[PDB]
């Protein structure tokens, strides 16, 4: 029912209070509280990531680091740290990785996988991390809009055009980690098939013993393309 009626049963009388209430106000307060908590969680995650990257002991700005093709050591370090962070987010008990990862940076179209930048592979029992630095630079350097356009519809030197890039790195590494988890939990054939679909994430990623609950940095907002 739209509204709820409360009547007080007074002993040995007839006069009564018959007060009617709505559920709309309670729903609004519930939604507001939930949105505030989700926003706080997202900001806490971003702060953790930024603090970790800061602890990496790197002198240069992040985008500058990703522009320096001459040295790949820093890029490998950053990618490794972000992957470890995602692993910690899913499974807080375990932090490090059992195996060793060899990192390769690629700077040509031929290496560029058409769309999935952080290609995650393994050969002879050793994980390999392939990276398309030019694609990373292109995404990080698209002049992110800063003007206040909500469009929701239905001391420190950290500008919005920087927090945005940090979040974008988080999202890209997140997609990479999902593909890697699919690879690990099943056969190589499953990983290859999923690469061309992205439609097999529904295996067990829901709230389960093996896959714990998490915001995953992408359920915070529903989104979609507006093509016909």
């Amino acid at each position: 029912c739209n509204k709820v009626r409360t009547v007080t049963e007074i002993v040995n009388s007839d006069e009564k209070i018959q007060k009617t209430y709505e559920l709309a106000e309670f729903d609004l307060k519930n939604l507001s509280s939930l949105e505030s908590y989700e926003t706080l969680k997202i900001k806490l995650a971003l702060s953790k990531y930024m603090a970790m990257l800061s602890t990496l002991e790197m002198t240069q700005p992040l985008l500058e680091i990703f522009r320096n093709k001459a040295d790949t050591r820093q890029i490998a370090a950053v990618v490794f740290s972000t992957l470890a962070f995602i692993h910690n987010r899913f499974h807080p008990l375990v932090t490090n990785f059992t195996n060793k990862m060899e990192f390769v940076v690629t700077e040509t179209n031929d290496t560029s996988i058409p769309g999935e930048p952080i290609l995650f592979t393994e050969n002879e029992g050793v994980l390999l991390c392939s990276v398309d630095r030019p694609s990373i630079v292109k995404m990080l350097s698209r002049e992110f809009d800063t003007e206040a356009l909500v469009n929701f519809e239905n001391d420190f030197s950290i500008t919005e055009v920087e927090a945005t890039q940090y979040l974008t790195l988080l999202l890209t590494v997140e997609h990479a980690y999902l593909h890697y988890y699919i690879f690990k939990n099943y056969g190589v054939f499953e990983y290859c098939k999923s690469l061309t679909d992205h439609s097999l994430f529904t295996n067990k990623l829901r709230s389960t013993m093996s896959t714990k609950t998490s915001n995953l940095l992408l359920s915070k907002f529903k989104f979609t393309i507006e093509d016909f």
Partner: protein, 224 residues
């Protein structure tokens, strides 16, 4: 003078940023803007090369124009000076995308409510459209060849800053940022990067399937 050079400059800047860099900016653009931009390019002698390039596509819109290396250098200089972003990669893909977009626009009729069409159009190399599996296998063959670059074996726990003040100050600095703007920027950016890589790859993309199904999968798995 008889020409508002400043306003036409602004309009040309906005439109070129909209088509070439494909920045997060996305607003309705009217024939007024394109007319102002073309007038601005024609006016500036420096931009006569760009003006000629755009004009050429009026008759045939199905080809990359043939140029010289010096012409390409001068064109890059003109575009960079116009955009005032020396710190960006605008080498050749940018120009091809701009030519494709203007080829679509000029050879498009008048519409009451937009068109909203993806920039996956008029790819180069005249190569037959290729599938994801074929190109993926071919390129992975090159990837899997050789050349790793760092051997991190033992693995140290991912470091974390233990100082709370270093975190509280960051929270204070980052709090005013609206979350919606950040998410929208990051998503659009990933989309544009994928679109450009795919278009250069000369394959057939999933317009509202692959990214759309990925989003749907995330929402479903998180929800149910």
């Amino acid at each position: 003078e008889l020409i508002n050079m400043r306003r036409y400059r602004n309009a040309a800047r906005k439109l070129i940023h909209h088509y070439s860099l494909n920045s997060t900016s996305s607003t309705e653009y009217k024939i007024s803007d394109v007319v102002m931009t073309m007038i601005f390019l024609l006016r500036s002698e420096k931009y006569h090369s760009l003006f000629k390039l755009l004009e050429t596509t009026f008759d045939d819109y199905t080809c990359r124009p043939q140029m010289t290396q010096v012409q390409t250098d001068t064109l890059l200089d003109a575009v960079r000076s116009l955009l005032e972003m020396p710190s960006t990669t605008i080498d050749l893909t940018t120009v091809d995308i701009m030519r494709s977009s203007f080829a679509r626009c000029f050879n498009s009729p008048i519409m009451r409510y937009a068109k909203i069409v993806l920039l996956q159009n008029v790819a180069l190399q005249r190569d037959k459209r290729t599938t994801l599996e074929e190109l993926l296998i071919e390129r992975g063959e090159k990837i899997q060849m050789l050349q790793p670059q760092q051997y991190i074996n033992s693995g140290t726990e991912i470091p974390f800053c233990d100082d709370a003040e270093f975190l509280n100050r960051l929270l204070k600095h980052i709090d005013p940022y609206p979350l919606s703007r950040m998410y929208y920027n990051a998503a659009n950016t990933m989309f544009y990067t994928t679109m450009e890589n795919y278009a250069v790859s000369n394959c057939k993309f999933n317009i509202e399937d692959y990214n759309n199904i990925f989003k749907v999968m995330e929402n479903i798995r998180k929800h149910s």
